[PDB]
Amino acid sequence: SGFRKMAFPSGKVEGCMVQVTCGTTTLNGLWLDDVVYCPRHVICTSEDMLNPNYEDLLIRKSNHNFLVQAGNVQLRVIGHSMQNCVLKLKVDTANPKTPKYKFVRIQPGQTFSVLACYNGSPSGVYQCAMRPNFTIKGSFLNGSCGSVGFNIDYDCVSFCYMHHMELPTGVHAGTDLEGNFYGPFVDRQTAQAAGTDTTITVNVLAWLYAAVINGDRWFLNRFTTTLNDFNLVAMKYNYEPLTQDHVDILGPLSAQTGIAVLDMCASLKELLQNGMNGRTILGSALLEDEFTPFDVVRQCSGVT
Amino acid sequence: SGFRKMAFPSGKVEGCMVQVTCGTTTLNGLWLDDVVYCPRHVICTSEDMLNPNYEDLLIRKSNHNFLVQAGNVQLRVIGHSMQNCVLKLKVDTANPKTPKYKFVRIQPGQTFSVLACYNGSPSGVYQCAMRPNFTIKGSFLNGSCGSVGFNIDYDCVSFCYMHHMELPTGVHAGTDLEGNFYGPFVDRQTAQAAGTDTTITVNVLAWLYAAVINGDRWFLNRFTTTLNDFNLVAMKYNYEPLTQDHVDILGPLSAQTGIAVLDMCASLKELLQNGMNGRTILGSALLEDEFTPFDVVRQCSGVT
Ligand SMILES: c1ccc(SCCN2CCOCC2)cc1
Ligand SMILES: c1ccc(SCCN2CCOCC2)cc1
């Protein structure tokens, strides 16, 4: 029993982290096979970052300008290319610790683990969610760029995020591993404001199911609702609309607990309208939205 | 910027996890050098667990009754001994992935990472604290016993916890790596009730400092207090007494922020007396106590 905000074990990703230096900028890269992936802004001076022309800055860079260090050993760069907002540095050595892997682009509401790194060395691992406004709420200091977000399926690491920047509001923006930003963000030091940070409703419902499975049940009420009625309440409270696809994904948790999805929606509706009245659910005084239905099943069933 | 509940990177510990089976009981062991450490209740039938005599049960066990599997490869057991509530299985092979390590016994209020494992395979990593009642609030299903808690200092893993049992209240109890339980708990299926789960005051103050460093400052007030006055409030709210040792440990955070420790105590006093009034601090609607002063400095400074 118990329910914790749990990250994937980080060892497979730890084995992939390297330091990339270009001139005076050092950040992190991801070494998979004979390619090192890193944010393209590694080529920028803090001056360049106000309005960088990346193609023009890169003309001034040779293979030997990218210094790649894996532990205390230098890798030989034998090619480089820019794919969207990432650089791919071809090295002469395949990473011997390369796990089975994929590159995936996640949808808002999806959770993943971040291995926060500095100078190619891991500092910590935490769980977070792609917010509906395509930001994440991370913990990143200068030097953390190129840190990655991932999910694991048994022995296959799916990489979904590489860290690139902090908005003036202290929320985080980044790319998939093909270098495409999540949301409308660009790798430039400009005014970039995030949109509404709505609550990920299907994840709150998943976590309420986790609560019931773990014996936190005070919030279960006598009511039900409809998807349309619930959705009127969701819109009022800046919650994401609930779809039938979300209802279907919650089916296994509904089945385990015997609480119909729409009844749990009616419990959620009362919590929104009434507040928690100083009570907690799974040690939280707010409704947690960074567990997916898949996360709750995985944790509640003990998948390795 | 940002502040996350962050676990240590788990790779060094992942390399140490093995499956231990005795008869029909499978749980996790920790393989360091040529010794595998696991809970002694691996020798018990669910029947034995009501009133086990471990010395008598162990007489019936030979080296060949302990099946130790590291990945898909069997280890040869060449000796076994019982140290308090752990078994030490001597194997014929030193773990080649043995990190630099220590065994430490932590104090209540200290935080550590747990690598939750099943059948010797890692499922997840999370951060938690030794509660003042010597329980922890984990996420452990059947088969998770022998999962370990640890801290890392650069390249040295300090192991502080091995998981042994769940109390009837769904909180967790375990040992240090010499097999001594934290608190008064025993490895028997009996009535064992936990004492008061007080709040770890020095950790709340550390997290309020983290909040100020990260720009969450609404709760800063115009007041100060004394250690005696604060402590009268702490006792009323089931907070641990604050000592001058705690004040001294908060000194670096006081210095960074320019907020005297006793002024932050006065802010905490007002939050206790007034509540949060529907506001949040670092995305929490309650006062978080599972970050130590050392954790806040580590995260806020980017140690690897
Ligand atoms: C993010 C990162 C990688 C992928 S793999 C599919 C992408 N393709 C395949 C390779 O050419 C470019 C487009 C998906 C999402
Ligand atoms: C917990 C686990 C191990 C230690 S090392 C010091 C313990 N000693 C040394 C070995 O003999 C038994 C006593 C400390 C706390």
CATH number at residue A41: 2.40.10.10
Residue from B4, B163, B199 whose CB has the most chain A CBs within 10 Å, to mutate: B4
Q: Residue whose CA is closest, atom 13 of ligand 2?
A: B178
How many domains does one find in chain A? 3
Does B107 lie in the same domain as B87?
Answer: no
Give which of A160, A159, A185, A157 is closest to A171, Cα–Cα. Answer: A185
CA distances from A129 to A135, A184, A187, A240, B263 (A): 9, 17, 21, 14, 35
| A196/B contact by beta carbon, under 8 A | no
Residue range of the domain that includes B126: 1-14+100-197
| A123/B contact by beta carbon, under 8 A | yes
Domain boundary among B84, B99, B114: B99
Does B236 lie in the same domain as B124?
Answer: no
Does A112 lie in the same domain as A21?
Answer: no
DSSP state of A8: P
What is the least distance, in Å, from the CA of B59 to any CA of chain A?
33
Does B173 lie in the same domain as B255?
Answer: no
Ligand 1 center to A241 CA (angstroms): 28
Annotated catalytic, B145? Answer: yes
Q: Residue whose CA is closest, atom 3 of ligand 2?
A: B103
Instruction: Determine if ligand 1 sits within 6 Å of the CB of residue A103.
Output: yes
Instruction: Determine if ligand 1 sits within 6 Å of the CB of residue A148.
Output: no
Does B123 lie in the same domain as B10?
Answer: yes
Give which of A235, A302, A267, A292 is closest to A113, Cα–Cα. Answer: A292
Ligand 2 center to B177 CA (angstroms): 8
Does A216 lie in the same domain as A167?
Answer: no
Q: What angle do CA B36, B137, A277 make, to 5 degrees?
A: 170
Nearest residue on chain A to B282, judged by CA atoms?
Answer: A137
A198: amino acid identity, one letter? T
**Residues β-bridged to residue A77:** A91
Does A8 lie in the same domain as A105?
Answer: yes
Residue A65: helix, strand or coil by DSSP? helix
Give which of B295, B107, B300, B105 is closest to B203, Cα–Cα. Answer: B295
* A141, A285, A303: residue with CB nearest B123: A303
CATH number at residue A233: 1.10.1840.10
Per residue in B201-232, is it b (16+ CB within 10 Å) or e — as a string? Answer: bbbbbbbbbbbbbbebeebbeeebbebeebbe
Domain boundary among B99, B118, B133: B99
Domain boundary among A54, A75, A99: A99
Chain A residues near residue B215 by CB distance under 8 angstroms: 170
The DSSP line for B205-247 is HHHHHHHHHTT--TT--S----HHHHHHHHHHTTBPPPPHHHH
Give which of B242, B238, B235 is closest to B261, Cα–Cα. Answer: B242
Residue that the structure tokens 């500095």 belong to: A118
Does B295 lie in the same domain as B204?
Answer: yes
Does B121 lie in the same domain as B232?
Answer: no
Rounded to an integer, what distance in angstroms lies between the CA atom of residue A53 and that of residue A188?
10
Just list the catalytic residues of A: 41, 145
Count of residues in chain B: 304
Does A163 lie in the same domain as A84?
Answer: no
- Close Cβ partners of A245 (under 8 Å, ≥ 6 residues apart): none
Ligand 1 center to A176 CA (angstroms): 9
CA distances from A249 to A6, A242, A252 (A): 20, 11, 7
β-bridge pairing A100-103 and A156-166: parallel
Rounded to an integer, what distance in angstroms lies between the CA atom of residue A27 and that of residue B219?
35
Residues 277-296, chain B, touching A (beta carbon < 8 A):
278, 280, 283-286
Q: Residue whose CA is closest, atom 13 of ligand 1?
A: A178
| The two structure tokens encoding residue A140 | 């990143």
Does A282 lie in the same domain as A263?
Answer: yes
Instruction: Determine if ligand 2 sits within 6 Å of the CB of residue B178.
Output: yes
Does B139 lie in the same domain as B8?
Answer: yes
